[PDB]
Amino acid sequence: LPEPPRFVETQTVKQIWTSMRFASLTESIAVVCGNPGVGKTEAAREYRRTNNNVWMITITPSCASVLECLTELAFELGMNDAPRRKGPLSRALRRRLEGTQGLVIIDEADHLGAEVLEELRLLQESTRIGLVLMGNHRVYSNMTTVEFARLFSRIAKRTAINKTKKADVKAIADAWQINGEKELELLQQIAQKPGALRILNHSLRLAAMTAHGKGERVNEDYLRQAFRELDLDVD
Amino acid sequence: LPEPPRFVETQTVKQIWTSMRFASLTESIAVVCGNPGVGKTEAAREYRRTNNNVWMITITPSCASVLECLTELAFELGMNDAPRRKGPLSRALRRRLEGTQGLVIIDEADHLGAEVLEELRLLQESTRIGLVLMGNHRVYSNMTTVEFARLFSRIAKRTAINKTKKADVKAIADAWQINGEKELELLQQIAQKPGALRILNHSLRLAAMTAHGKGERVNEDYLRQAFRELDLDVD
Amino acid sequence: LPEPPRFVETQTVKQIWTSMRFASLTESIAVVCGNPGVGKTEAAREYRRTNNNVWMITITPSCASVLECLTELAFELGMNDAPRRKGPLSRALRRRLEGTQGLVIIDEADHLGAEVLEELRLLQESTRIGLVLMGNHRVYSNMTTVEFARLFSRIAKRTAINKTKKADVKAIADAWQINGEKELELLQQIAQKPGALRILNHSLRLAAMTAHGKGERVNEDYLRQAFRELDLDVD
Amino acid sequence: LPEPPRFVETQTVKQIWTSMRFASLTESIAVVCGNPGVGKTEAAREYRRTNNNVWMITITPSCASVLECLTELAFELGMNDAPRRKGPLSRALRRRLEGTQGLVIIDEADHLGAEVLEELRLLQESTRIGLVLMGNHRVYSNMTTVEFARLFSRIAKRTAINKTKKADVKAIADAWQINGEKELELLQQIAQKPGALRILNHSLRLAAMTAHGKGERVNEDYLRQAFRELDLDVD
């Protein structure tokens, strides 16, 4: 019956905003390597939504080249007049973004070739801007160890988040107006299982839509009805 | 002599609308795997008919590629200016649908290659929208098990409907104004045989057109005259 | 200090030999679909080792065609003079194997195209012999449903083994001369975890080589020392 | 404990031998159209095994052409010196088989093109021999209706067998030494379900191998244990 919150600031969100603003204002490269289902994509989307001079793209294996990634960057910077070449595209990206004190955000940096990430680091080094990587722990694990070693000298900042926190899901429950202590422990048990923010928000929206359709309050019984579903331990 | 109902809300329809709104507002992927003749196509059509920011396509083996599916999507989103390439088409689809909080509905997801469904999940993950699959039980059975395993982490919701319910055909009979208890049992016997909604609506419209042509009421005799046809147990 | 047994007859081995001799003497097709680590490969190898007029090949994705599979068959039947064509190869395979009352054994039948398995079933139907498939549960799950439906009429026999039995690991412990009841329960706990025969034989040979290097008897402590290794619950 | 019979003469076998010898000595074309699992393949194999001047091939969709079928015929007639052309191959087949008063047997004649079956009927008409077709009821159903109409004038004989008989399974039970009346009725119930000879011989060999492994007689309980398997009514 109250509003379902689309987002809440957490301890992990306040950490990743600190590292984000650090990589931007420092104008240096930071890696966010950690297991997904923790919210780094939506946190970076929230940062780009709140703050200007911030740019965030995604990288697919269908867009794993240098040219496709720079085309994504040209679409993100607001330039539909991107040349199909690699050279003058790169120099136009260098022209547009110089002096902006901007921030480039890279999601799924584990799908990168060495030439692609090398062109991105030489780009940001020739632009005096900040670069932020996302993905699993393989993003850092592809570097330990000699081809990204100068990049390992440029990579100074990383905040690695494997699993969530107690105050993390506590602030989430505060956003969703949850005060049951057994409910708190059950949400922590949800946070124990992987895909934590995903499975958590699934269970929360199931319980919320159930409590609105039945006209009631989300209780621990609606949490058991939601979390008992989704077939997580089914092989 | 009264109006033949084109649609009725059922328990299965109320379940699949719940899962549909869940996959949309959750902005995550849900699978509807189950044997056909249960009404999932017309229920999704009804949901798109009642609700805005909702998009539903179909997938044929003649349109089983990435490019044909994205062309279907571009036709569904109202963009006749779709480029024939795969790249700028995908980025235009990403531009148009971002911020819309929309819902993509996929019918017959059993005909999918791994690259096609991978491009769709990377699309919706780069669009912050909801994706709904339809088809038989092979849609989930193609995943159990490693190539869609990260998608099995994204696939959290599924409502599997094999056969219908008693209150299902009861609400259908209430839409068709049927109060015979033997008529109720005979409609349940229709629901026992597969292609349940198809064979059921066939028998209902035969009995209705028969009762209008003879100027009478649909009785159990018109139900036997309709259901005795269609040659279901003929080899 | 006694001899480590390379093989023991089990209840599952006696079942799969029954189904094997049934598919051979019946001269019809039988499917063995079940999760691996149960010993179906070594049981079929043991059957071919003990019995004549028995042939067993493997199928890789590198040999997933009709021609490569029939080349494997020609190598298995003892014919190095196999033509590189598909036709006269198939007719020579039909000539050599007719009247032999033989048995063809197929391992990893989940990697099959429809043309390959169709050529194998038309081969064995034109040879009056038995065909045995192996693999996971996807071997049968690729048929439920119309292209292998006549093959589903030819497939009459299947013995599906998901997990092991109590008398299974009891006979294994009897082969390895184990009489501890807590040791029996711990071997059953090994059998609970998947890759059951693989992980079991790994733990047994670790404990046996440890007891021979230390000059002792395999105890429950050597079982904990072996089974505590292998890093099964490590992510 | 007695010998499992590989074959028994039935009423259907005595009928199909009558039609077989009729098509041969008449030197004319006969069609055997009927649902499989009735034993027409093994009956024709038995006829070729007992009788000389008898030839039986199979036809696959991989060998659906004229040339592949005549190559099968040249392999069946004992001529490995078959030319790869269509002409001199056909004339050598006409030379070898003239004056022999032979019999050509065709299995799965439903996979035939019109040119293939036309070349076979012009072959046998230019050889003064007999031609026998096998397959489902579609073999005759592809002719009703003008392109095989002169062949419908040459096709004078057909014996269509859809399902088995009481004396059929009675003679089978006499071959398998079965004297239980409830056992007789249960074997008739096996004969009711399609794939009759296939499912029947499967159940018989399961009960026989079970009675030999347990050292007992095949009873009605072994028939229930065999026939209760095979998962026939499982979807």
Ligand SMILES: Nc1ncnc2c1ncn2[C@@H]1O[C@H](COP(=O)(O)OP(=O)(O)O)[C@@H](O)[C@H]1O
């Ligand atoms: N503050 C928040 N409150 C609730 N859910 C959140 C929050 N931030 C992120 N999420 C969740 O995170 C999920 C996606 O992030 P995630 O999958 O962890 O990204 P990645 O795959 O890049 O690690 C979304 O389903 C969203 O519900």
Ligand SMILES: Nc1ncnc2c1ncn2[C@@H]1O[C@H](COP(=O)(O)OP(=O)(O)O)[C@@H](O)[C@H]1O
């Ligand atoms: N509420 C309803 N009342 C009556 N019939 C329905 C209803 N919803 C769906 N149907 C029937 O469902 C049929 C088509 O759905 P279906 O074939 O089950 O889709 P799919 O093939 O994707 O499973 C239509 O013939 C329609 O008559």
Ligand SMILES: Nc1ncnc2c1ncn2[C@@H]1O[C@H](COP(=O)(O)OP(=O)(O)O)[C@@H](O)[C@H]1O
């Ligand atoms: N009788 C037996 N005693 C001990 N181990 C066995 C026996 N039969 C099979 N195995 C084990 O089975 C393993 C391989 O079989 P498996 O991997 O299950 O085949 P598949 O992969 O085809 O299922 C081997 O490691 C072997 O040790």
Ligand SMILES: Nc1ncnc2c1ncn2[C@@H]1O[C@H](COP(=O)(O)OP(=O)(O)O)[C@@H](O)[C@H]1O
């Ligand atoms: N006299 C017989 N006694 C027992 N079984 C028989 C006999 N004749 C044929 N069969 C059975 O018929 C089966 C194959 O024939 P079938 O499949 O009917 O041929 P088609 O597929 O061409 O119709 C075999 O499994 C064999 O066991």
